[PDB]
A paper describes a structure:
GluA3, a subtype strongly associated with disease, functions as both a fast-transmitting Ca2+-permeable AMPAR at sensory synapses, and as a Ca2+-impermeable receptor at cortical synapses. The GluA3 extracellular domain tiers (N-terminal domain (NTD) and ligand-binding domain (LBD)) are closely coupled throughout gating states, creating interfaces that impact signalling and contain human disease-associated mutations.
Overall, we observed greater heterogeneity of both the NTD and LBD tiers compared with the apo state, with fewer classes exhibiting NTDs interfacing with the LBD (20% versus 45%). The inter-tier coupling therefore occurs in both resting-state and active GluA3.
Author numbering:
A (entry chain C): 2 to 304, 309 to 381, 394 to 410, 423 to 496, 737 to 756
B (entry chain B): 2 to 304, 309 to 381
The structure:
Amino acid sequence: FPNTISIGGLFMRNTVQEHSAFRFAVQLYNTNQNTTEKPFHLNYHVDHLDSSNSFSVTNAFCSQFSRGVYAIFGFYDQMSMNTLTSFCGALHTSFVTPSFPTDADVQFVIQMRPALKGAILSLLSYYKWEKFVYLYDTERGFSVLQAIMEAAVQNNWQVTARSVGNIKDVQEFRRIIEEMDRRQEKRYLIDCEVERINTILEQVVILGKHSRGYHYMLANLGFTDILLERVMHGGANITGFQIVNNENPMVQQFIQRWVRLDEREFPEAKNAPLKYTSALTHDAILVIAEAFRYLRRQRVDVSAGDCLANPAVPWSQGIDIERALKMVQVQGMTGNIQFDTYGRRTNYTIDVYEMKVSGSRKAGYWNEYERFVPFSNRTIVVTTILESPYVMYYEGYCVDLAYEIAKHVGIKYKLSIVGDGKYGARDPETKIWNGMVGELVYGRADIAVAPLTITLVREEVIDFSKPGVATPKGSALGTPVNLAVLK
Amino acid sequence: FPNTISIGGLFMRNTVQEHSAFRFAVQLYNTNQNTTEKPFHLNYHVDHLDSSNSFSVTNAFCSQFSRGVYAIFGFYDQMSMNTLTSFCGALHTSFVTPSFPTDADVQFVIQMRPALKGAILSLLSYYKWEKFVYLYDTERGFSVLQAIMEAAVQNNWQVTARSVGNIKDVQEFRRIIEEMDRRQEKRYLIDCEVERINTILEQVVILGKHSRGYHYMLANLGFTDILLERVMHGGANITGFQIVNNENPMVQQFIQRWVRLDEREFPEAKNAPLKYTSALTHDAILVIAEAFRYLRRQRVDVSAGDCLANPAVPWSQGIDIERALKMVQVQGMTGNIQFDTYGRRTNYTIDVYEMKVSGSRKAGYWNEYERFVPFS
């Protein structure tokens, strides 16, 4: 068995705290005095790669491979995931990563990040969500999206799915929020990156939808990195998922020893909140150390060419190292760590937090076997037209009719005069309705108590009561308004 | 100058007819008896990619690079474009591709699928499309989506965009169509693949939303590969784009010599409709031949290691080959062929077809300088 074991490290951009955690964990493993805990020295060959250039990624991976490594700890993005995964699976080199788990079943990859699909489904079942929105981007895989769609089909849910990964203008976010609010959707499920979640939440705050009655389920293990002070001040319900529990004594020790690090040699240390990815990196170091100690104990011989060989010769010892890595049983900052045959984590203990007015609170926890266990009248827009004797400065015949109708039906109504001041007609060129007909067809109003003449063209886009009151087609107010008009 | 020019071929899955067209065009160039037309013998080395294992793609590209190739004709998709483009740019190896043009500006890649942004925008402005649906997928890049959104912001349109790339259940298509119909959306822009376009058209036919009052603009070259008879009987307006003019004498001669080929030697050539990708492959052979003939004429010397050498030193003659490939002005099956500094088509004409009940009719043509010119 070698006296010193070297591993490769692959870090992307915007990844500085994780690098510090990696180096600090290696230093901690080396510094251990007990020979049993540290039977061999550990070395790293950290390198930085740009996922936007596959050539550079291949060169970095091949430098790591040629220099001689036993395992590679690295990050991959949706762009560079394929290259690293395929090369690692082809050359028989285990790849420990804390990034998003791969959708497909691939060997020689150990993913430190637990999957959120089961927890999300369990929370949706617990909260009894039968109809909601799902704003998603495909930067962490399609597993969650496919699971949500399959569950909705099976359970006959009403999920409004929207891909927000390609949106670069916040006005589109505002339009989406307004359109979905007009449909009376109180429940959102945001499965996006931290910055995208922040943008969506801030657009919500400006739109003023953070009041009571709104529930936001942030499907991201970045609850600490999400800015929601405004939203908690609003009073809306927020549900989040986390894996690093501050009450764990190991986490407390790691944090207390992590703060005293100088910001020069360990940048970002003791400056910003500890990202969960850093905990995953520390746990990855622990997993590698335990696996290699197990390999040494069992007296397994371990001991490099080029990536591009037509007769690709895999390591005879690669399978042994992969098996040793995947059979590990350790306790780390993220709890129990166990991997199945495909390198995915098992025995999750995801902490489910329910944000309260005072602050964040632990709602409960989710495990693979115990499932989830807890720790415990809108104003209706009435579009009208300014025309005597129907509407005057409001008072008039139509105002009285609207008051009577809103009395016969149980509703609260707010009048609004159409900005363009037109009754309505289809433009022959652009096929765009205007006036109150346009307001009703496009959902900007719920009812039009105005002298709208009943016509064949209009009857095909909206529903008229008896001699008439107009409503958008398919609305729930059609029959009540008709009956009120009768009486 | 070498007496024999060798090129590489990288053909992904479902690329049989393009392979046959590649071989046939190379044979046609070689069989020419004119001394000036064929000053060298053209050889090709064909490999088939998997496109789903980056290791396989890199292995194939490195085999091609090592065996010795002056140019590489190939295909790529969104899941293998980055690898081939990066390797070709780094090693100064020209990559002639009929695939979708890259969103970003990259070097050492000659793309000859004309961009549809200008034609689509011109048609939208000409038809007064100030409110329409936009069903798109990202299998050919985000260029069209970005152009449409910028145009909507600038012109105050009311585009309703929907990414149908990740939809695998037709019920989602039906729900989307029903929702847009409840909002009185009569005009659609479907920038999707041929299979997804066919699925969407099947859904609209099932829902009956193909009457005389609906207009569908299929923003995808390959108008002949889309099943439109069912929607044709409905009477809805359908607009499509093409780059191969069937009445072109060169296309006529190629078809005449192309339908009388052995089905064993040239599979898919007979009893199948020519794809625009095959025409682009033939035009790519024309471009390569013209570029190397020009290089020979100017007495430019052109004449290889491994992919991953640190530092990777590009070979000095790659600049000259790329420059000679990008300065060609040749008339092929897809009309005029010229390239700008970034290896994209210029001075290209896109035929706009409005399909009627009687049959498809060439409504007009679009050019960069002269915009949409209807025939009336």
